[PDB]
Design an enzyme around this catalytic site. Structure first.
Site, PDB file in Angstrom:
ATOM      1  N   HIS A  60      32.457   4.848 -18.058  1.00 28.56           N
ATOM      2  CA  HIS A  60      33.356   3.971 -17.306  1.00 28.56           C
ATOM      3  C   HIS A  60      34.791   4.490 -17.398  1.00 28.56           C
ATOM      4  O   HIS A  60      35.626   4.222 -16.533  1.00 28.56           O
ATOM      5  CB  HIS A  60      33.291   2.552 -17.865  1.00 28.56           C
ATOM      6  CG  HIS A  60      31.908   1.982 -17.894  1.00 28.56           C
ATOM      7  ND1 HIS A  60      31.165   1.770 -16.751  1.00 28.56           N
ATOM      8  CD2 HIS A  60      31.124   1.597 -18.929  1.00 28.56           C
ATOM      9  CE1 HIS A  60      29.984   1.280 -17.080  1.00 28.56           C
ATOM     10  NE2 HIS A  60      29.933   1.166 -18.395  1.00 28.56           N
ATOM     11  N   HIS A  90      42.547   3.862 -23.488  1.00 29.20           N
ATOM     12  CA  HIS A  90      41.861   4.493 -22.366  1.00 29.20           C
ATOM     13  C   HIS A  90      42.705   4.278 -21.112  1.00 29.20           C
ATOM     14  O   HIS A  90      43.711   3.568 -21.152  1.00 29.20           O
ATOM     15  CB  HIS A  90      40.480   3.870 -22.155  1.00 29.20           C
ATOM     16  CG  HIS A  90      40.530   2.408 -21.865  1.00 29.20           C
ATOM     17  ND1 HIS A  90      40.479   1.452 -22.853  1.00 29.20           N
ATOM     18  CD2 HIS A  90      40.696   1.738 -20.702  1.00 29.20           C
ATOM     19  CE1 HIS A  90      40.611   0.255 -22.313  1.00 29.20           C
ATOM     20  NE2 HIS A  90      40.745   0.400 -21.008  1.00 29.20           N
ATOM     21  N   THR A 194      39.301  -6.219 -18.896  1.00 30.28           N
ATOM     22  CA  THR A 194      39.122  -5.978 -17.471  1.00 30.28           C
ATOM     23  C   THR A 194      37.764  -5.394 -17.112  1.00 30.28           C
ATOM     24  O   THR A 194      37.508  -5.078 -15.941  1.00 30.28           O
ATOM     25  CB  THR A 194      40.230  -5.087 -16.910  1.00 30.28           C
ATOM     26  OG1 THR A 194      40.251  -3.846 -17.619  1.00 30.28           O
ATOM     27  CG2 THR A 194      41.573  -5.786 -17.029  1.00 30.28           C
TER      28      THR A 194
HETATM   29 ZN   LIG Z   1      41.368  -1.086 -19.699  1.00 27.48          ZN
END
Ligand SMILES: [Zn+2]
Length: 256
Positions: A60, A90, A194
């Protein structure tokens, strides 16, 4: 789930009902409605003992993991009560420079958005912290395309070795201080992660000042794959979630 057309953010509500919760993120920040709250203490970032360990492609995004077994890289003050330890950071980026960030400022989208994730130490570990309304503190920094960011290059140079999902590489002695902007003015509001499980356990801290990266730098983010070493190549781009309704929440600003 993912960010593709068939398992993207629009489908998440089916496996994760909280997707339509009351304090979801990201959201659009209205600079004219956010209120200046003089009582906010300045942010306190202590990353001088930070110990980076590994970088991995989880399918992801790619996470840089830090040793959070002690108070060596912490965030404190601001709207936070207590100490939060840095466990990982990230990014979220787009297929084009005109998009990629998760949060938006007056509807403006940046090329990408960096997330430095910390958990409230009073909860013992990350797993218990994500189950509390005040368990995590994410530091959000926007990235715009322009001059190259020297301190980020060490990261783009190893992306070649974690191209596919599941890959990881030793990544020691990385100093996260190199990613921070000059100023620390910020906006803050209560939100969620998120990406699924999308738990509403986060106190968001978004920096007003974005950092600059070169076109060549963000370009290498786009050469990553969502797929594992076996599957057909599926470029990793546009792994960001769209703004969510602010509902009954207010965005505070530490500056005026
Ligand atoms: Zn994030």
């Amino acid at each position: 789930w993912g960010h593709g057309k068939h398992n993207g953010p629009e489908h998440w509500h089916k496996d994760f009902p909280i997707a339509k919760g009351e304090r979801q993120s990201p959201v659009d920040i209205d600079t004219h409605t956010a209120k200046y709250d003089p009582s906010l203490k300045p942010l306190s970032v202590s990353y001088d003992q930070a110990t980076s360990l590994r970088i991995l492609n989880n399918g992801h995004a790619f996470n840089v993991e830090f040793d959070d077994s002690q108070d060596k890289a912490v965030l404190k003050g601001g709207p936070l009560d207590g100490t939060y330890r840095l466990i990982q950071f990230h990014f979220h980026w787009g297929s084009l420079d005109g998009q990629g960030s998760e949060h938006t400022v007056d509807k403006k989208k940046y090329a990408a958005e960096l997330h430095l994730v910390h958990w409230n130490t009073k909860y013992g570990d990350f797993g218990k912290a994500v189950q509390q309304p005040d368990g995590l503190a994410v530091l959000g920094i926007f990235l715009k395309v322009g001059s190259a960011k020297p301190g980020l290059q060490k990261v783009v140079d190893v992306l070649d070795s974690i191209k596919t999902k599941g890959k990881s590489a030793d990544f020691t002695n990385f100093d996260p201080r190199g990613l921070l902007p000059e100023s620390l003015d910020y906006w803050t509001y209560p939100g969620s992660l998120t990406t699924p499980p999308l738990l509403e356990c986060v106190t968001w801290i978004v920096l007003k000042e974005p950092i600059s990266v070169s076109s060549e730098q963000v370009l290498k983010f786009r050469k990553l794959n969502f797929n594992g070493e076996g599957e057909p190549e599926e470029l990793m781009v546009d792994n960001w979630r769209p703004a969510q309704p602010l509902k009954n929440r207010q965005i505070k600003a530490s500056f005026k």
